[PDB]
Write a protein that binds this ligand. Structure first.
Ligand code: COH
Length: 153
């Protein structure tokens, strides 16, 4: 469980992410696709994008980035009490999109990488540690739902 002080570090930097949701969303998805190409193959809607320039130019990719970060933000602001938000997400990602938990670890790494690039002064070691913990909590709760449904993996 994150302490109140750790949640404050997470939300203080998230308020900055919200100043440019679309720019952030885009950098995250691109970092994910370049670092872990197998992840792009899960998106029939983005599979045709081959280069980073092509990814940067896609307005549809930018729109999905806002969708991803908006959902994540609603979860983070619940400070661990995210049962109602997390459930629909685990169900669709496990049963409809077939996303293994490992890919959720990959996007977590991408989020941390981007926050670090864009907000050095608001993202020192202490904030990076709190953010990692918040993302691990998210994965842990989703992994439990996956197990229930028969998808742990
Ligand atoms: C490697 C693939 C991958 C990852 C790691 C991932 C991780 C995450 C993530 C973790 C931080 C968040 C908050 C979301 C949030 C969402 N994802 Co995904 N998703 C993934 C693949 C998908 C796919 C595929 C879709 C459907 C896209 C489409 O066709 O519109 C998707 C749809 C969504 C939607 C639309 C509604 C729904 O279908 O659930 C939201 C919200 N998500 N996703």
């Amino acid at each position: 469980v994150l302490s109140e002080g750790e949640w404050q570090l997470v939300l203080h930097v998230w308020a900055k992410v919200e100043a440019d949701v679309a720019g952030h969303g885009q950098d995250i998805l691109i970092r994910l696709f370049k670092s872990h190409p197998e992840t792009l193959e899960k998106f029939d809607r983005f599979k045709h994008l081959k280069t980073e320039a092509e990814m940067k130019a896609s307005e549809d990719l930018k729109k999905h980035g806002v969708t991803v970060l908006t959902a994540l933000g609603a979860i983070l602001k619940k400070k661990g009490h995210h049962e109602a938000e997390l459930k629909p997400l685990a169900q669709s990602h496990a049963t409809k999109h077939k996303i293994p938990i490992k890919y959720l670890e990959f996007i977590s790494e991408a989020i941390i990488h981007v926050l670090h690039s864009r907000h050095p002064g608001d993202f020192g070691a202490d904030a990076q540690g709190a953010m990692n913990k918040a993302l691990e909590l998210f994965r842990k709760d989703i992994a439990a739902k996956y197990k229930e449904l028969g998808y742990q993996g």
